[PDB]
């Protein structure tokens, strides 16, 4: 699951696992 | 057809559109309703950044679907 | 053409690039502006990690678009 993509909970964008903030809206992944 | 456009503040904008409208047309309707220039709009639907030349139906955007508006 | 690079600490870097530039060339330009060695740079665009040997045009990166830089230690 650590290499999995992840959906931003604010805008839903499907993000790369290397980012810990959303590429679109910069919402943090770990809130 | 009504769809919803949700901002990052959680505000839900109700927009009247046609199912065959292009994304560019939708941005123009957001410009008409909210006054936001289309070049400053990014729309996300179910994980995907929406591209200007495609239609709402192309993306399976339906009645009362929610698009997420991020300002760039 | 201009492209922008966003870092995790919020900095914006503006680069001058051609669409034919490789990702390696882009990392070298980031090093000039920042000081981060290219082998510690990861570039993300549209949810994908960009590969050193390919070019901006390979990823359809256009004028005034934005890449995200994260670090690899
Ligand atoms: Zn987001």
Are the CB atoms for B37 and B22 separated by under 8 Å? no
Tokens of A23: 């590429």
Class of domain C1-73: alpha beta
Residues in a beta bridge with A1 = none
Closest CA to B28 of B10, B11, B5: B5
Q: Which CATH code, of 3.30.70.360, 3.10.20.90, 3.40.50.620, 3.20.20.70, is assigned to B2-72?
A: 3.10.20.90
The CA A8 to ligand 1 mean position distance, Å, reads 5
Q: Using CA coordinates, name the residue in chain A closest to C10.
A: A26
State the nearest Cα–Cα gap between C65 and chain A, in angstroms: 12
Identify whether the C-beta of residue C2 lies closer than 8 Å to the C-beta of residue C62. no
Method: X-ray
- What is residue C35's DSSP assignment? -
User: Please, are residues B9 and B33 in contact by the beta-carbon 8 Å criterion?
Assistant: no
Q: Check if the beta carbon of residue C17 is closer than 8 Å to that of residue C24.
A: no
């Amino acid at each position: 699951d650590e290499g999995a993509q992840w959906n931003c909970t604010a805008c839903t964008f499907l993000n790369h696992p290397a980012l810990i903030r959303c590429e679109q809206c910069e919402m943090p992944r770990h809130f | 057809m009504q769809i919803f456009v949700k901002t990052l503040t959680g505000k839900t904008i109700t927009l009247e559109v046609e199912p065959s409208d292009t994304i560019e047309n939708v941005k123009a309707k957001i410009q008409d309703k909210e006054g936001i220039p289309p070049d400053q709009q990014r729309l996300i639907f179910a994980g995907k950044q929406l591209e200007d030349g495609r239609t709402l139906s192309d993306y399976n955007i339906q009645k009362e679907s929610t698009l997420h508006l991020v300002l760039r």
